Design a protein around this ligand. Structure first.
Ligand SMILES: [Cl-]
Lengths: 198, 206
């Protein structure tokens, strides 16, 4: 229903003082909306041209590689079809499996040029985000990297690292983040990429 | 890999602080905080008398888990569902439910469907997304539905606060995240905590 609409109304109205470009506020709003946690207004950091990078990748029909099944099933298929984007839950792939399982996903990824131009969503595996910031140091170039691992170990470094990598990103500073934030930010990107950017 | 999780649980116990939870309730709250790195859940999480024990018992009975979102269904760990083989049923996205829905609230079809099919009795219900679902279910409870346990953790700004109140004054055990906070991740974490406690026969080995 329109509950979605009124919920966003309450979010903006209640958001308070926020400084985000017309294109990136919609991302933060959705994240706040999905968690009832206004602290994301302060924690969510974007790099230069993060959204455009996302909108283009999405429109370009890009592939969404995610680090958790919760993220895959969370992506509303009725939204993925619009630009027909392929979601790839690596860690659960039979090949990756057959062979930590986080590094096996990246390898299997650097072994097919998937990392290039793809939107990467990380909401759980900090180590995985490290097998990427290094893989980025080795040439791999994804369109956008959603660095939102939630956790207590390896999360600050993994994000610090990503905010230092030469690729577009959106991070949730600190220990906070998770599958819900990744999903929320993706649904927001697919929504704009379908609304022309308004 | 396993060590990291144990380590991470340690860290949450270290930074939790004074809390008013029981020995069986704590492992649940800890897991929810671990899953979100959000310490406010120590203060927002409320249990009903006998909720946890009601949960372990159902888990061990092989009780079904009915949820209001696919993220919850997929978020659950297959290896953990395997311990006591607890079938998971995603109602809101269910075929028949969506079918009935279109015909004539998809949240109403869900409960009505679940009830008619005899799925609510003995079941553990996980709500982290649809408030109107928790309201329908609560009304359905006043008509004779007896779920083993209900996790009322919808997140949001519309119908959320009242949906939880309607649950916290009902005749069924429950666990709620007070306020507007909650979500799929909280239900999954709470369920995983229940399964682990059950597997360990009610003893917090973590
Ligand atoms: Cl506190």
């Amino acid at each position: 229903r329109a509950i979605e609409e009124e919920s966003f109304r309450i979010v903006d109205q209640e958001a308070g003082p926020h400084g985000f470009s017309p294109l990136e506020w919609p991302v933060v709003r959705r994240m706040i909306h999905a968690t009832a946690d206004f602290e994301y207004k302060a924690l969510t950091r974007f790099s230069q041209g993060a959204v455009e990078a996302g909108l283009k990748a999405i429109q370009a029909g890009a592939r969404i590689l995610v680090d958790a099944r919760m993220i895959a099933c969370g992506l509303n298929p009725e939204r993925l079809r619009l630009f027909g984007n392929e979601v790839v839950e690596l860690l659960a792939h039979p090949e990756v499996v057959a062979r930590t399982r986080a590094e096996a996903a990246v390898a299997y990824a650097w072994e097919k040029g998937l990392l290039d131009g793809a939107i990467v969503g990380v909401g759980n595996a900090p180590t995985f985000l490290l097998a990427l910031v290094e893989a980025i140091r080795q040439g791999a170039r994804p369109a956008l990297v959603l660095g939102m691992p939630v956790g207590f170990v390896n999360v600050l470094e993994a994000k610090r690292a990503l905010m230092e990598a030469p690729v577009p990103w959106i991070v949730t500073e600190g220990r906070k983040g998770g599958s819900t934030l990744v999903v929320a930010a993706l649904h927001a990107l697919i929504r704009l990429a379908a609304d022309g950017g308004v």
